[PDB]
Write a protein that binds this ligand. Structure first.
Ligand SMILES: NC(=O)C1=CN([C@@H]2O[C@H](COP(=O)(O)OP(=O)(O)OC[C@H]3O[C@@H](n4cnc5c(N)ncnc54)[C@H](OP(=O)(O)O)[C@@H]3O)[C@@H](O)[C@H]2O)C=CC1
Ligand code: SF4
Ligand code: SF4
Ligand code: SF4
Ligand code: FES
Ligand SMILES: [Zn+2]
Lengths: 47, 82, 74, 123, 117, 693, 68, 123, 57
């Protein structure tokens, strides 16, 4: 109101953002998977 | 000094060998020579030999003890005490 | 960061013995701890005074006569 | 070390008066899973005035520190140090602690005692 | 009734609005702010306001304290808080309460008290 | 020597005789487990850790199966997946549907391993329902919900083997097997709270913490405990402005993964009795005041009082950080005073072991040194109260190897056999000239542990003389590979205080101060302050000194600043601020900087980098964090500081007494804690709940 | 519209076929407290005044002097 | 097709610092010449010399940057800002972000020494 | 539509402060505080919804 204009100021939040990613799992969830490569695109094994 | 002396020296460093000898041999002589001063010996790996003295109202002075002999170590010490 | 340009210090004692602790850096979400009443706040000078007070988060009590005339102060 | 500070557009105070910590998460004492302990976290030390205060209307926790919830993840301590230098951030490295290995044998629960038992193992 | 403010002035509040709930005078949790403290700290926003219109829910702790103990033959009572009139799953997760120790034992979810007999 | 085997195709090399789960962990293969734990005896009762071994026909328990050369192990077979599902099915069938009300929820290994390895849905719909269990009262610290217990026996193994508290056990048999004490007995041990961490489920929980938070909403900060001088590494879990709980983190050379009950539960003392605004005495009452008012009042009292030289006395308490002590000393010296004292009895005079070499007041054998011990002499020291986790360390060493332990001083309730040699200095003279002296002469890793409480005696030099002579003789006790001389500090600030030389001059102990500055100093008495003295108290809690003060300044607590602390080992450790200080409180070194500017003597550092510099100026080891380095001056120190100056000291006839009367309340935070007061009444010796017979 | 009592509000929006007065006893809520209906009081002295139901998280020391 | 707008310059990273110096001085000339157009578009209280002074201060800030890539980015962004200002794409509110000093005194207490900063918990 | 907190037929609150609503809330509109009630129950001491943050999902 003093300046009669939209002004920019350093950010201040009435409620700070709460980041809940601290609760991510302590155990590896999925594992390695499986490979779907065709046999014509795998290096051969000797004998 | 009048009130405080601090010896910083390495434990394994070669540049600190004269300082190590000085402490090891003449620390008791120094303590008796200056009975009211408070003397501290502190060691750490990367640090260069140095001595601090604290005279009065917080005034301090320091000199580096990268030297050759114990004699010269005590020379630098006595110079700084003056 | 914002500042409390109006305050000399962070802890304040009123003459009436209330202890006021300023919270935050001084912006819109900060509070000085003071409470003020501004009679005639909807007028020419009062609106500027109310803007300056509310900017740093001192609580402003505005007595008014006509409702529509004070809305901008909010 | 390129001074990317001056091209990012971040506030100057970030590379002037803020300190970051680079570390690995400690193994939690409550769980046996270690899945969160391998990444290198980078996060900001708190600022006293701006960290958190109680809102006088409803009681929410306000903040003036825009970095308070930000945490970067790096695949190595060296990647994290490189990034911090490239942003002009003053940092501290907290070296991780690991469990010292020892040999454990179930049979040790039943070793014959030649003198007085020091304690009764119970199972 | 009369609450002394930080200003040193007096706030008058009718006795009935100082009660934490209509069915209970005092707080039921250490962290819970009392009505007196609420008025002392928020009186500015209560001026020219009608207290009788404000929400005044009944305190559940007295209500659950009014429910009679259920007596059970064995060592274990089972509770689920189910609604036998409606369809679907309307209670709480079904749990089992040990009643071997003397006295009554409360359901963790709904507060219903069971006892061996 | 190391042998070699294969796990999931990978090649792993491990020491012979190690358990298969250890090799799996080394080779980076994850194996689910409940009853196994790295610090407890192997149990093998949960059956979650089954793997296939080609020689074995049926799956084996990984945690209890010794590795052998050429072993081939598969953790990923269809049989192993099936077994994991079967075991989880059996584990969940009587487990209570409690997750919404259970404190373990969100940090629960049962939940997580159900998700990772179990069925997605259960098959158990029996109309007779589940087993239920009585709840059990074992004191005010550990709340029990025993429906949740999965019978892993971690709590029992910890309570028996590690803490030495055999009251805990398992009663009955089969389905009705119950963890407990079989009758109403407290789980009475200073290490008890650790079982809350060890319980994989919500069966044993933190009672003061109950229901207040979920793990996903907590900021986690790695920091340092200051309840004793061990410097246990901790994680502080906070939300917004308040600290919710304190948990151990692993430091194998300090606390290994344990903390004591004070470190765990005195945190609630940080949200009550706090100092939030400056106070000024006016008559018999304090009045709130601005910082400018209070600092000006200190300055005016200094001008009026006009202390010359050592009439400005500075006292440092048990909890203060090194930066604050350094700033206070620098300002005090710039005032012309050498009267920088410690807060302990006879701390007006200098300590009798000296300050010249660090090895004269430290645990020269590292904490880890206790693992190598073959004989230990305890001199005026009850480790179970002074350093609880180190007491556990001694017990572990005693249990696993032959080791002889004797003590001179008060009879101590110990978790290991001790030989009592008497409570007097004459008894010490007899012992070091007798059979235990010979034991020490003959041993490979001896150590003599001297308590910080002997230093506080008037006759302290006598003791330090006796020990010193003995040490200067016996090569096994002090040689170039092993220093067996040890001083065990009890307060987190003492080692750093001696490090910076926060010690009075000889002439300073004569003078009667006109101005006293207490820095977290709450051991002070009425007698220690002159009536005419102007007293400034700087702290975070209102306990004792604040009551004695003329001006009270609110300072930050240890959870609110990034401070340096030196533990008994001489290890310099750095903490991290979890929250900011409450109200109008301030970081303490900044308080001292401001007040020195009000006094004319404005200190030369106003920034954190400059303070760390100044610290490096005072002692280079204060900035070398988490490092322990031996002294090259071990022989010089003993002669120059212990045997040299202490000849004239005459020994008293007074017996050695217990250093700390109550373990549970020792400093301002613990004495501000409702949990510590409750526990002090609950765990008293004269209470039958704490009496096995 | 806020003067319409709950239940009737659902019926008026074709939520339920049967009106509240016609609903059998088994499908009514049991209350252990007295039921009171109150409409929207916004723009009125009876408008809801929100507040923090917690006392502050940090409690200050009550200052007490002692004599030396 | 999709054609460029008024005062658009295709992005070209100069291979040499001298060839960038030419472009940079040309951009400075463009800013100085547009100053009166700026004062008309954005209805500013202050004078044309104040605008030109501000422009000089902006260009001064990067007077000692050495790495060619960083100078290239600083130039390309400075040209973006010129295009934004000269086309009236900015409103007054964002344009006046550049002139914080032109606003009046924010209050009686802007601390400079340690004690004043410490009394406001900003030490 | 507008949110409400329900009771059991006895009059006891149903909410036991598990905080699952607070965790799932896509708008972070819920703020919860809890501790042990003087009768031992797990119950909320604070349950707030910012209706101007809520997305009514
Ligand atoms: N502007 C000038 O040059 C000068 C002004 N002053 C004084 O400054 C003060 C405010 O200045 P200014 O902003 O310009 O004046 P305004 O007329 O703009 O505002 C005056 C305020 O006083 C209120 N007011 C007037 N009469 C009454 C009344 N019976 N009851 C309640 N409120 C009333 C008005 O409320 P409402 O809107 O409801 O009518 C209004 O809010 C005045 O006291 C004025 O005498 C003196 C020196 C210079
Ligand atoms: S112990 Fe784990 S699985 Fe069991 S109720 Fe608690 S959170 Fe749920
Ligand atoms: S109480 Fe916990 S630690 Fe003890 S046996 Fe049961 S599940 Fe294991
Ligand atoms: S906290 Fe939320 S999800 Fe949990 S019981 Fe209460 S209302 Fe339901
Ligand atoms: S961890 Fe191996 S059987 Fe329990
Ligand atoms: Zn129920």
């Amino acid at each position: 109101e003093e300046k009669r204009r939209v002004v920019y100021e350093p950010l201040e939040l009435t409620q700070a953002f709460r980041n809940f990613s601290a609760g991510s799992t302590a155990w590896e969830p999925v594992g390695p998977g499986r490979d779907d490569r065709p046999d014509s695109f795998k290096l051969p094994t000797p004998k | 000094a009048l009130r405080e002396i601090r010896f910083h020296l390495c434990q394994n460093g070669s540049s600190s060998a004269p300082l190590r000898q000085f402490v090891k041999n003449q620390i008791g002589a120094f303590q008796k020579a200056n009975p009211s001063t408070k003397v501290l010996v502190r060691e750490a790996n990367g640090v260069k030999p140095i001595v601090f003295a604290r005279f009065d109202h917080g005034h301090e002075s320091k000199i580096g003890l990268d030297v050759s002999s114990e004699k010269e170590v005590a020379e630098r010490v006595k110079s700084l005490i003056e | 960061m914002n500042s409390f340009e109006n305050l000399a210090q962070d802890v304040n004692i009123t003459r009436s013995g209330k202890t006021l602790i300023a919270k935050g850096t001084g912006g819109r979400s900060s509070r000085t701890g003071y409470t003020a009443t501004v009679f005639g706040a909807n007028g020419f000078l009062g609106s500027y005074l109310t803007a300056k007070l509310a900017k740093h988060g001192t609580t402003v009590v505005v007595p008014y006569r006509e409702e529509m005339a004070k809305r901008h102060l909010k | 070390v390129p001074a990317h500070e001056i091209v990012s557009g971040a506030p100057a105070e970030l590379s002037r008066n803020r300190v970051v910590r680079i570390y690995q998460q400690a193994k939690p004492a409550t769980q046996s899973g270690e899945y969160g302990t391998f990444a290198w976290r980078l996060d900001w030390d708190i600022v006293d005035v701006a960290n958190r205060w109680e809102n006088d209307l409803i009681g929410w926790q306000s903040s003036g520190d825009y970095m308070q919830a930000t945490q970067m993840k790096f695949t190595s301590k060296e990647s994290a140090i490189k990034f911090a230098n490239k942003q002009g951030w003053d940092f501290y490295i907290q070296e991780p602690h690991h469990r010292k290995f020892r040999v454990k044998q179930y049979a040790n629960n039943f070793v014959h005692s030649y003198g007085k038992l020091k304690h009764i193992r119970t199972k | 009734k009369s609450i002394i403010s930080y200003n040193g002035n007096t706030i008058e509040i009718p006795e009935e609005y100082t009660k934490q709930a209509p069915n209970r005078d005092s707080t039921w949790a250490p962290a819970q702010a009392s009505k007196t403290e609420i008025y002392k700290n928020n009186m500015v926003r209560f001026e020219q306001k009608d207290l009788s219109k404000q929400p005044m829910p009944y305190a559940g702790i007295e209500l659950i304290a009014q429910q009679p103990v259920r007596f059970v033959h064995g060592n274990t009572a089972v509770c689920d808080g189910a609604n036998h009139n409606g369809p679907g799953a309307q209670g709480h997760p079904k749990i089992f309460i040990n009643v071997d120790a003397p006295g009554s034992h409360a359901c963790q979810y709904c507060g219903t008290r069971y006892e061996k007999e | 020597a190391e042998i070699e085997l294969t796990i999931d195709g990978h090649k792993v090399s491990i020491e012979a005789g190690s358990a298969l789960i250890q090799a799996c962990e080394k080779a980076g293969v994850t194996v689910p487990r409940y009853c196994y734990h790295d610090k407890l005896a192997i149990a093998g009762n949960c059956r979650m850790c089954l793997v296939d071994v080609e020689r074995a026909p049926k799956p084996v328990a990984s945690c209890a199966y010794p590795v052998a050369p050429g072993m081939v192990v598969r953790t990923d077979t269809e049989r192993v997946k099936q077994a994991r599902e079967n075991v989880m099915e059996m584990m969940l069938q009587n487990h209570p549907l409690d997750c919404p009300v259970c404190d373990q929820g969100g940090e629960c290994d049962l939940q997580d391993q159900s998700m990772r390895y179990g069925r997605d849905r259960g098959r158990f719909t029996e109309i007779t329902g589940k087993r239920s269990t009585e709840d059990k009262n074992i004191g005010p610290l550990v709340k029990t919900s025993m429906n949740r217990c999965i019978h892993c026996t971690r709590c029992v193994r910890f309570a028996n083997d590690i803490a030495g508290a055999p009251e805990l056990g398992s009663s009955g048999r089969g389905n009705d097997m119950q963890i407990g004490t079989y009758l109403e007995k407290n789980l009475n041990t200073e290490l008890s709270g650790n079982v809350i961490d060890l319980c994989p489920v919500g069966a044993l929980t933190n009672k003061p913490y109950a229901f207040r938070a979920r793990p996903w909403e907590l900021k986690k900060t790695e920091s340092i405990d200051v309840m004793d001088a061990v410097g246990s590494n901790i994680r502080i879990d906070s939300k917004g402005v308040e600290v919710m709980r304190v948990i151990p983190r692993v430091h194998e050379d300090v606390n290994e993964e344990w903390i004591n009950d004070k470190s765990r539960f005195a945190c609630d003392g940080l949200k009550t009795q706090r100092l939030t605004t400056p106070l000024i005495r006016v008559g018999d009452k304090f009045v709130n005041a601005t910082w400018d008012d209070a600092l000006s009042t200190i300055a005016k009292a200094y001008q009026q009082k006009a202390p010359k030289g050592d009439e400005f006395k500075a006292v440092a308490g048990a909890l203060v950080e090194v930066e604050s002590m350094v700033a206070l000393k620098d300002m005090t010296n710039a005032l012309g005073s050498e009267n920088t004292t410690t807060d302990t009895p006879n701390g007006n005079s200098a300590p009798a072991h000296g300050i010249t070499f660090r090895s004269n007041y430290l645990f020269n054998s590292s904490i880890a040194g206790i693992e190598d011990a073959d004989a230990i002499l305890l001199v005026g020291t009850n480790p179970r109260r002074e350093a609880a986790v180190m007491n556990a360390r001694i017990r572990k060493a005693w249990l696993r190897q032959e080791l002889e332990i004797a003590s001179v001083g008060p009879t101590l309730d110990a978790t290991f056999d001790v030989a009592e040699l008497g409570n007097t200095h004459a008894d010490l003279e007899k012992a070091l000239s007798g059979e235990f002296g010979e034991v020490l002469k003959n041993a490979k890793n001896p150590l003599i542990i001297v308590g910080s409480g002997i230093t506080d005696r008037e006759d302290a030099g006598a003791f330090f003389n006796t020990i010193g002579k003995f040490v200067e003789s016996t090569p096994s006790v002090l040689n170039e590979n092993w220093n067996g001389y040890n001083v065990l500090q009890r307060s987190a600030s003492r080692a750093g205080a001696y490090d910076i030389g926060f010690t009075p001059s000889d002439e300073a102990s004569k003078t009667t101060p006109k101005m006293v500055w207490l820095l977290g100093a709450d051991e002070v008495a009425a007698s220690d302050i002159p009536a005419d003295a102007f007293v400034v108290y700087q702290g975070h809690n209102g306990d004792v000194g604040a009551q004695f003060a003329d001006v009270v300044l609110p300072g930050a607590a240890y959870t609110e600043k990034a401070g340096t602390y030196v533990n008994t080992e001489g290890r310099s450790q750095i903490s991290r601020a979890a929250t900011g200080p409450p109200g109008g409180a301030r970081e303490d070194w900044k308080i001292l900087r401001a007040v020195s500017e009000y006094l004319g003597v404005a200190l030369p550092y106003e920034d954190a980098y400059e303070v760390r510099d100044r610290l490096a100026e005072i002692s280079p080891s204060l900035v070398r964090y988490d490092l322990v380095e031996p002294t090259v001056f071990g022989d010089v120190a003993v002669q120059h500081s212990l045997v040299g100056p202490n000849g004239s000291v005459t020994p008293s006839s007074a017996p050695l007494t217990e250093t700390i009367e109550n373990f549970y309340m020792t400093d301002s935070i613990s004495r501000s804690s409702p949990t510590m007061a409750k526990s002090s009444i609950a765990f008293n010796k004269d209470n039958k709940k704490n009496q096995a017979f | 519209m806020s003067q319409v009592e709950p239940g009737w509000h659902f019926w008026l929006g074709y939520g339920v076929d049967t009106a509240p007065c016609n609903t059998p006893k088994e499908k009514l809520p049991i209350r252990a407290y007295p039921y009171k209906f109150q409409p929207n009081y916004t723009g009125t002295p009876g408008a809801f005044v929100t507040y923090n139901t917690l006392k502050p998280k940090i409690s200050a020391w009550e200052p007490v002097t002692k004599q030396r | 097709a999709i054609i460029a707008t008024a005062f658009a310059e295709t992005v070209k990273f100069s291979g040499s610092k001298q060839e960038l110096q030419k472009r940079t001085l040309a951009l400075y000339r463009q800013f100085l010449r547009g100053a009166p157009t700026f004062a008309d578009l954005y209805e500013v209280q202050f004078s044309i010399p104040t605008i030109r002074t501000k422009i000089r201060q902006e260009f001064e800030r990067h007077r000692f940057v050495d790495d060619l890539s960083i100078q290239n980015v600083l130039y390309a962004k400075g040209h973006m800002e010129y295009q934004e200002c000269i086309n009236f794409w900015k409103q007054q509110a964002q344009f006046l972000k550049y002139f914080p000093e032109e606003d009046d005194i924010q209050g009686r207490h802007q601390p400079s020494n340690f004690v004043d900063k410490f009394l406001k918990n900003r030490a | 539509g507008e949110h409400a907190l329900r009771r059991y037929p006895s009059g006891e609150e149903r909410c036991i402060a598990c905080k699952l609503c607070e965790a799932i809330c896509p708008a972070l509109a819920i703020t919860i505080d809890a501790e042990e009630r003087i009768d031992g129950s797990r119950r909320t001491t604070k349950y707030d919804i910012d209706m101007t943050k809520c997305i009514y999902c």
